[PDB]
Design a protein around this ligand. Structure first.
Ligand code: XIH
Lengths: 730, 730
């Protein structure tokens, strides 16, 4: 009869387990068990020790992570990890010789590395340090400098600058070892003309004068960083002092004005696939380039250009989808919007074809989330086709030769507990692990590709199950409402003994940004749980216009004009929830983080009178303040020649007046490098000039995540009390 | 039956008048009446128009201020005023020819001047621009550049750098015209090695990238700016292209290590008086320097050195008092602590005397606040001797020849309404205006020095009086309590129909910094009024140890150890107030600004359990973060060789834990150049790491005063609501 305390959430009392493995071959994988790396044989439980409780404790308690070379002859030991942005970070490393049974101590690697990675085959290493690329053909051998143009916050070799790291590649890495590890391709960014943002850092109270941090950051419409792509022949290194990398120049239909490097993908060792994007992501080109043995140069013939375009809005969900090539690299499959606006799979030939470059393998009013594997005869993927639940995730597979032999591999399994699946296939797809994140407690099982015989159960959260028994967990409803004749899904977290006759306070959780999805069938133990289990508050989210994986008609609905429909629909959703009955019209709130904090703010400021209070954490207050890549992708350029007007008609501070009818809570990280603070400072200011009172809270030296332990606990406790005050509880 | 609304306060509904005149001669003065400058004859009401409703409206609504040359032949028109720090600011100027009846338009003065001032006689002007000194012997004539070493945030010629402006001279000016206007003395500051503080400014929401503001600011113990003093002969200018200023080097007993320039004072035209201070204000020297006609050099003979010292703490209230010389400049009177620690007046001879340099003219257990005038036979001053009320201010006068002939000139007048006087005597003291700020509504009267016959009443706030009739104004009690056998004054603002039988909530208003005084007999219409008149809250202040003008024993009580006794005593004061009866022990708060915000914080963090909640606005959180001049004056240097230990044992964040027993409100200006914000950011941080919840509020782009209109209204409304929540009202 115990409720789910805020402490339960904050102190993470009820642990949710998982099985994160690392396929080492087509039939064996690695697993961390009690700080011991084990090798499992998919087929039989056959296990074995790969690395002991030991080895790790030499560098003691600072072993951040490990990386096993693909020949399993060496292991990378990361330690002295230090964050820097979402994915960037610097560590120190040591190579462990599995055979010689000891730590390699000769040609060590720089005690401040920015990035490192094995090749795809041998024990070849490529790392970035002081912004330059270095290579080591063998763990024992000396380093070979590849670039020397590297310079802090100016020239990036093999790693992304701030914006690319966040908005394009999703990671720090800008390296790509070719198969058979001959070449090593990398990108190089010049931030030279990109403006700087400078926020203060305070550090220990012992620091008398506070430091200052600058970052080349391009806000909407400002000068963007430039790019160049190179491929260097790794095999020569031993016979020279310097090697001259060969450069690939982007395709002409892109080199006329600003543009970007979407994605890099090696096809075969003499073929590589690069995707480019215009600054206005209205257009994109994916060139295929071949290596010329004779002239030792890479060619990217317009004949193999391949163009992707969008008259509705922009390309891809957040960028063109990655291509998947066949062994002989003759054809490739890629996810693109079909004639009806539904992201599906279709075949392409290396060469382009006049208005026929595709042939879809998938049709329907649902979308393919991601291609997972390409066999000689099969294509494994993941879609939300099942039960017409766009909020669901299932693993399908199609026989290449017969586009009819399309069978779902996870639909059946456990329909009661699982509707949201994660996958992971062995090197050549002989086995495949399943990640049930589905409605019920996550269930990790492993199967044999051949006939789908579930070999065994890797992890059933039985333990967690046994613990939640003695606790009043709330429920989660996942349905859809319908407006202007269209399904719009939503999800509600209903408190324990939910009684449809009573009235409960409502809280909307928001994101609502382009291609966002808050209404899905995944299991989660978060703040909303405490809010429902113990405060008896209903937490709901609603995926409205401009969103999810329900087709472009819906997603692009927002194109060129954010702060419009996605906001309104968030309001209607509350209207609808009230019409459902069980909601106390006089106690409805709304909060959001990032984009959500925006909408939250934009909603509280609409004067709809539907909401009583809200909370915005590190919200964007006006699109000019946000980074270019993201912003422009939907908003265009903030210029009278383009879309300036819409940038201006969607300012949070312009709706200041209307904030008198609301209790508002604004929160922001003092060291937010993503959503600058300027954003909130600009908001507060506005409200103050309007004579509107509100509540604020800043978090000294916190990221855009306010994720430090102490701060994490602090901010939620605070928001809780804010809701308590607002809802007349506490 | 109307109470005094917060609006009444914020919108300044009940206007308090005053009479600010400008003595032009020993018998006439200037007064602004309905935007018309009038000339009044002290003796008869005889008036006359000096400048019309007109003239001012040419430059329209931007005429910031005016300055009339001493020959009354020209008038300075200041416009395009732009603030910059407490006193610094830049304007544009135009000279008006009273005789020719028009604006001089020939050799205009720089459209961005930093400072300007007439001589003491003619129409000579000296101004600073781009950090250099320029002179114009006549409004119509061309400018004569005096210095060329000037450079932004590096070399200051004729104006003070940040710290000197705030902590030493109290103004931007660093110019001094000699009498008979021959020489022009100025100071020059080199900030070269002074560290920088850089805070961000956000400006209009249209500014995409927020600006950054840097300032050479010396925090405790850091490298201080250096000084040099010069005197240039103004009479030569016309006969050269460049003139070479002569420099005075400070006295040897100061040039061994860091030191300061206390004060500058011209005696006669061939004599000037400079006061120097050691970085450790334990010691100070006041040299008298004479001009050598023959060698064209200034001498500052050790024979006329004059040393001031303090074994108890530091020199002066905030710096050595200014000397007052006789016509023949043979002797001078200056305020210094006597044998008992009471700031009094004593005579000095130009030459020093072995342990006898003084002869006090004033004895007693009270202090002379300030010397106001020195006649051929009289010395007018102002002390808090009357009724033994250290919180009172009265105008006394002593006959030089007879140190017995000491008569008070304002004591009698209106003992019921006035106990706090302001003065202003005509050039040679033939008349004198009185400023009654006393207990009742301010009363401005003018008298004839000769026999003190009150000529007439300049301003009686009759109007304001008539308006407050229809309003329930609160009362103000000014008494003293006694601890360890010593009088310690305090003041309480009692709500309307105050009934000693009931119980009221208590709010302590704080400063409590060295030589501070909150308990005085002055009339004021502030926030505390609304708090009492409408919220029925008692607002009280208590001048405890280390403070006021009650002698050094009390003031120096804090020396070398701030955050000690002044804090404790602030607590005892609340204890005592409770023992008085009429205070609701379960509803006692405390708030403060600046130093007060410190104590407030230090109090809430003492775990005395006496206070329920509090508010700290832009508080200092630890002395290392504050400027050198102020801090070191009481704390010394933050080094193990000196007083580091006490710097560390008085951190607000070190008392974080104890904040769980309190509702706390922290507020801070985003552009605070005085108390950096780092100070609060460091506090918040601390509390967050302690797991303590509190309430915060930042004011985007506000000074250390959060004095913009919109922000001013905003912050008080907010604090009000904070008290309402805390006191269970609203
Ligand atoms: C409550 N309260 C004060 O604390 C206060 C004050 N005047 C001063 N000063 C005298 C002139 C030089 C100036 N640097 C200091 N302080 C002290 C202070 C401490 C720390 C930071 C800023 C400040 C300021 N300004 N007043 C008027 C007042 O009400």
């Amino acid at each position: 009869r115990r409720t789910y305390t805020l402490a339960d959430y904050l102190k993470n009392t009820f642990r949710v387990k998982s099985y994160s493995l690392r396929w080492v071959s087509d039939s064996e994988y690695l697993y961390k068990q009690e700080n011991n790396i084990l090798l499992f044989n998919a087929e039989h439980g056959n296990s074995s020790i790969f690395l002991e409780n030991s080895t790790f404790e030499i560098f003691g308690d600072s072993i951040s992570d490990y990386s096993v070379s693909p020949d399993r002859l060496f292991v990378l030991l990361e330690y002295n990890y230090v964050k820097q942005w979402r994915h960037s970070y610097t560590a120190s490393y040591s190579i462990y010789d599995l055979n010689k049974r000891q730590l390699i101590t000769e040609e060590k690697i720089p005690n401040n590395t920015q990035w490192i990675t094995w090749s795809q085959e041998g024990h070849k290493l490529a790392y970035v340090w002081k912004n330059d690329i270095y290579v080591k053909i063998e763990p024992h051998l000396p380093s070979h400098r590849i670039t020397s143009t590297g310079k802090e916050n100016v020239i990036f070799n093999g790693i992304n600058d701030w914006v690319y790291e966040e908005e394009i590649f999703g990671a720090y890495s800008a390296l790509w070892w070719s198969p058979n590890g001959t070449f090593l391709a990398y990108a190089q960014f010049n931030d030279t003309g990109v403006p700087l943002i400078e926020y203060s850092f305070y550090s220990d109270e012992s620091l008398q004068y506070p430091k200052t941090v600058w970052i080349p950051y391009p806000k909407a419409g400002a000068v963007n960083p430039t790019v160049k792509f190179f491929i260097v022949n790794t095999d020569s290194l031993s016979s020279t002092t310097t090697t001259i990398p060969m450069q690939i120049t982007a395709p002409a239909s892109v080199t006329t004005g600003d543009h970007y490097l979407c994605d890099v993908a090696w096809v075969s060792e003499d073929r590589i696939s690069l995707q480019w994007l215009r600054r206005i992501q209205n257009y994109s080109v994916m060139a295929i380039c071949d290596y010329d043995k004779t002239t030792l140069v890479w060619n990217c013939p317009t004949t193999q250009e391949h163009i992707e375009t969008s008259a509705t809005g922009w390309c891809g969900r957040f960028r063109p989808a990655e291509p998947h090539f066949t062994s002989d690299g003759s054809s490739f499959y890629k996810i693109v919007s079909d004639k009806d606006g539904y992201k599906h799979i279709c075949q392409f030939q290396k060469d382009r074809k006049p208005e026929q470059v595709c042939t879809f393998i998938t049709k329907g009013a649902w979308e393919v989330i991601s291609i997972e594997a390409l066999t000689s005869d099969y294509l494994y993927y993941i879609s939300n086709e099942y039960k017409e639940m766009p909020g669901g995730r299932n693993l399908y597979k199609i026989q290449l030769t017969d586009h009819t032999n399309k069978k779902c591999l996870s639909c059946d399994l456990n329909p009661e507990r699982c509707q949201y699946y994660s996958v992971s296939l062995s090197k050549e797809a002989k086995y495949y692990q399943l990640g049930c994140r589905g409605p019920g407690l996550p269930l990790y099982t492993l199967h044999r590709s051949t006939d789908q015989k579930e070999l065994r159960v890797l992890e059933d959260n039985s333990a967690l199950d046994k613990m939640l028994q003695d606790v009043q967990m709330p429920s989660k409803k996942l349905d859809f409402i319908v407006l202007n004749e269209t399904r719009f899904w939503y999800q509600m977290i209903l408190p324990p003994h939910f009684d449809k006759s009573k009235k409960y306070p409502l809280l909307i959780d928001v994101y609502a940004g382009p291609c966002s999805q808050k209404a899905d069938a995944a299991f989660r133990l978060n703040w909303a749980t405490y809010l429902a289990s113990t405060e008896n508050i209903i937490v709901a989210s609603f995926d409205g216009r401009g969103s999810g994986y329900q087709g472009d008609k819906i997603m692009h609905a927002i194109n060129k004009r954010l702060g419009t429909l996605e906001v309104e629909d968030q309001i209607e959703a509350a209207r609808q929830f009230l019409k459902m009955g069980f909601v106390d019209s006089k106690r409805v709130a709304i909060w959001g983080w990032s984009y959500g904090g925006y909408v939250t703010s934009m909603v509280l400021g609409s004067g709809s009178g539907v909401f009583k209070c809200g909370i915005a954490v590190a919200p964007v207050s006006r699109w000019e303040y946000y980074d270019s890549v993201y912003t422009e992708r939907y908003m265009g350029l903030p210029t009278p020649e383009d879309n300036l007007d819409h940038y201006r008609n969607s300012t949070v501070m312009s709706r200041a007046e209307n904030f008198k009818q609301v209790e508002y809570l604004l929160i922001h990280g003092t060291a937010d490098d993503n959503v600058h603070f300027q954003q909130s400072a600009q908001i507060s200011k506005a409200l103050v000039d309007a004579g509107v009172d509100f509540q604020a809270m800043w978090y000294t030296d916190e990221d855009h995540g306010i994720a430090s332990s102490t701060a994490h606990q602090h901010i939620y406790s605070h928001m809780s009390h804010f809701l308590q005050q607002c809802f007349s509880l506490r």
